[PDB]
């Protein structure tokens, strides 16, 4: 039935676990960690199959509770149980948190072998359980808007604006990556509206640090609510480092032929939905300072060598997701400077994409105005997602 109960922290480290059948290995854990906890482009569903193994999960605060099995289980049973377990837990140590899990390892094991024999949900009601449970839980505990604003037509605009940065090895290892973002809000709304905003759980509230800063108008307690300034303002600003969607992969095949020629082939792969177009794409492949000349052939877009720049610059107007293109170059060298071999600068890209590389998605924006006549259904709403390259570099 249930083949394994795993509890992960916000890093996808397994804090505590119990495996109830020998099918479920180290393999199952990694699957969950990679394909759900660090899901990049996939839209999460409470249930997931990978490699003929099913994964159920609930998210509590910063903790992931997962259930795993390789059999045609009763799906509803699994989820119900998970809420009850969360019921039982929260009545020993309150908030279901990394901290509180950590402090209650011994009890948690205890609870598990009672609440669940061999993956079969057993009676798990709080009053009933005293008899079986020896342990106790370790517990732990305006001015920016003006009065009388009227519009014929109540409107709001949200812009999600992201810059994506990357350093990648020639073998495609992400050496480092971060996104810097902000949501800009432009609102012509009557009166003094309270707004309730909702997003996916991407943003957590020279070394990039995961941070989020909100406008002075923003309250917290899930979601966030504010009465917005009128017109245009920055609702929030943020930087993230995990689970970034790298829209392009650059695959370099640079080959030094003697000390006189240089063979350069570069392939770029777009890695997003097929129905989406990236634009203003440039690839900037550097050349050595002693370059006699260049023959470049490319069959998408156009390309040219620029000596003052010591670079080949390749331009592409549009590229759809899941496509591939190639440039190839042959470069001539005259090697006066003897020794001190060429230290290769990285290949860099520009591009713009109609999505947020961090994965941020806007789920809702509710407008409620207490005095005045209009309501949320009356408010026109546009969102836009602009994602841009920052320092997007690949070693070659």
């Amino acid at each position: 039935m249930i083949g394994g109960l795993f509890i992960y922290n916000h890093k996808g480290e397994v804090l505590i676990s119990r495996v109830y059948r020998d099918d479920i290995g180290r393999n199952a854990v990694d699957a969950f960690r990679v394909n759900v906890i660090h899901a990049r482009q996939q839209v999460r569903s409470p249930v997931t199959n990978i490699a003929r193994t099913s994964f159920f999960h609930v998210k509590r605060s910063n903790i992931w509770l997962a259930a795993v099995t390789k059999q045609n289980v009763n799906a509803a049973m699994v989820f119900e149980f998970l809420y009850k377990m969360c019921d039982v837990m929260a009545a020993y140590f309150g908030k279901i948190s990394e901290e509180n899990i950590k402090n209650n390892f011994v009890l948690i094991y205890e609870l598990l072998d009672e609440i669940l024999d061999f993956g079969y949900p057993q009676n798990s009601e709080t009053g009933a359980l005293k008899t079986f449970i020896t342990q106790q839980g370790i517990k732990s505990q305006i001015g920016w808007r003006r009065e009388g604003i009227k519009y014929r037509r109540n409107e709001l605009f949200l812009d999600v604006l992201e810059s994506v940065n990357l350093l990648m090895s020639p073998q495609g290892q992400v050496l480092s990556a971060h996104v810097s973002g902000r949501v800009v809000m432009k609102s012509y709304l009557s009166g003094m509206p309270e707004c309730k905003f909702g997003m996916n759980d991407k943003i957590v509230i020279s070394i990039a640090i995961d941070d989020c800063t909100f406008h002075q108008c923003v309250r917290l307690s899930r979601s966030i609510s504010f009465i917005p300034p009128d017109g245009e303002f920055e609702l929030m600003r943020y930087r993230t480092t995990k689970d970034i969607i790298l829209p392009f992969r650059v695959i370099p095949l640079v080959r030094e032929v003697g000390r006189t020629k240089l063979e350069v082939k570069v392939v770029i792969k777009s890695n997003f939905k097929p129905s989406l177009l990236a634009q203003k794409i440039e690839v900037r492949i550097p050349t050595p300072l002693n370059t006699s000349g260049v023959q470049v052939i490319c069959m998408k877009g156009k390309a040219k060598y620029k000596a003052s720049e010591n670079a080949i610059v390749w331009k592409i107007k549009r590229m759809a997701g899941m496509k591939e293109s190639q440039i190839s170059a042959e470069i001539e060298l005259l090697p006066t400077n003897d020794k001190k071999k060429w230290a290769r600068p990285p290949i860099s890209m520009n591009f713009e994409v109609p999505f947020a590389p961090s994965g941020l998605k806007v789920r809702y924006l509710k407008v409620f105005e207490p005095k005045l006549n209009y309501s949320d259904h009356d408010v026109i709403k546009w969102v836009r997602y602009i994602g841009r390259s920052g320092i997007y570099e690949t070693r070659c």
């Binding site: 402090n103 073998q171 095949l253 080959r255 003697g258 082939k265 591939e324 190639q326």
Partner: protein, 600 residues
Amino acid sequence: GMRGLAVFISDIRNCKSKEAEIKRINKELANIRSKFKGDKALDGYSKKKYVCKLLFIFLLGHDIDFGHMEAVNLLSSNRYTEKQIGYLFISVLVNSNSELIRLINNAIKNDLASRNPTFMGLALHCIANVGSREMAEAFAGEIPKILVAGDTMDSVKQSAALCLLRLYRTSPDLVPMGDWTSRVVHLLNDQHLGVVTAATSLITTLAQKNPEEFKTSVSLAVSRLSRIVTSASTDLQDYTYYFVPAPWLSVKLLRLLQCYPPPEDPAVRGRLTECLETILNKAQEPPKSKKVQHSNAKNAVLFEAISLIIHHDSEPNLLVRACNQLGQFLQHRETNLRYLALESMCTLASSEFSHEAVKTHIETVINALKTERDVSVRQRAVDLLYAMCDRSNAQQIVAEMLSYLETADYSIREEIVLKVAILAEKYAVDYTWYVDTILNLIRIAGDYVSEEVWYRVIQIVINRDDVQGYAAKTVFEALQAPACHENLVKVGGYILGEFGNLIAGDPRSSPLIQFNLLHSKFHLCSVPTRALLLSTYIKFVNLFPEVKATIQDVLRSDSQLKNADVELQQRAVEYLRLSTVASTDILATVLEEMPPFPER
């Protein structure tokens, strides 16, 4: 030492919750702040311990916003244990307060100006560890003097040298090349190898922008290296690590020499050659210990000597010897050694004196990849095959890449598929080889195949009559694995629509069998794929009149004519209509063999 310290630390460990941990830390902070602020003076023991408790708390993650003044007092103590702790605190907790900085510089000055090497070393380390401009400005001028004075102790010279190096990296303008250069060079002749080691790190950095000024180091560096690598068991006992004499100083001397060209004095160049050959020889000797530490220490030196050889690019016998030794590492327990051998060999491939030697090891690389477990090693094996590939190599390398591909992981497929296409294009001997390669590529790993690339292969096959029948059979026999790649159905379906006739006569690849094979894929396919198969199927009504009725059957069906997609619904109708309303002469006019592509 400090009972109160152990107690605080063990109290912290016994905490059952982060909440309790933070309670016990706040308690200590109150206590420390009282005592620091209080009427009673503290004995040094207490200053020492409490400063040291605050540092502990800093290292646990919490903020420390007082204490600095107390640790600055400890600097002026005459008790080592008190200064140590004071100096450790200001090194790990640096504040920008310009009174403290001035105060800390006095403390330094006294310790430097004492003649106590223990106190000198604490101050020297502080400078090196913090490295602030204010410190550079106070002492950068003095440090070389300490370093070259005939009376300063060895440890103080070691520590002065690395301090000077840190200062040179943070504050070059405070480190002019004065009169101390020759004597810093002279240190390479010190009896104390720790001193020699330290000086070498400094000179290497200094030699990067000041080569002419330390040009004399080459000769000294070479004669030191050769005495080290030939010295006996009972020589350098202090600096012998798992039977390998001065491995780290060796490495460092080989690294200094990469700042210069081959030695200009023929004598010196000769000694260096005997030197490098000795190192190469030792690689061929068996282990003196089976502990991995011995071979690693030995091989560190070997690898650094290989860099020097590559950097000089000037002795073909050493470069070849180098390849061959690396080639022998490619069969090795150590993933470490495999990794480094392939990496280093990639370099050697791009040199003229060495390219051909490397090609010699093709079989070994291919066998290593074939069995290799570590992904990063695999990757480097494939990079090597790419690097050495040429007109001779190409068919073997490509054969082997494709073979490997048939059982490869997913980890590595994408890059190999890419390399196969590119090499295929650069080095195709006959259009049939190219065709046989791509169709296979597509058969095994078609999911990573650029659309452009299966375009090419479909055009070649049109423009050359000789390979069409081969291409048809390959695709057919490929298509009849129970599992296959979608691009195979694209490529396969097109080739068969256009040339199925050349195998239709075989009774095991008949028109009926061809069709039903395709059709067992149809409804598992993408729409453009089905769009193609609807074209294939209509060419089949024409070429093979015998099966027109089963095909018309699939065209009249709901899933085709009431298809939600425009192309499919448009094709299935157009095609049924063709087969129904078109004269046979008409049908034949429309679905003739396609004309050959233009070559441009």
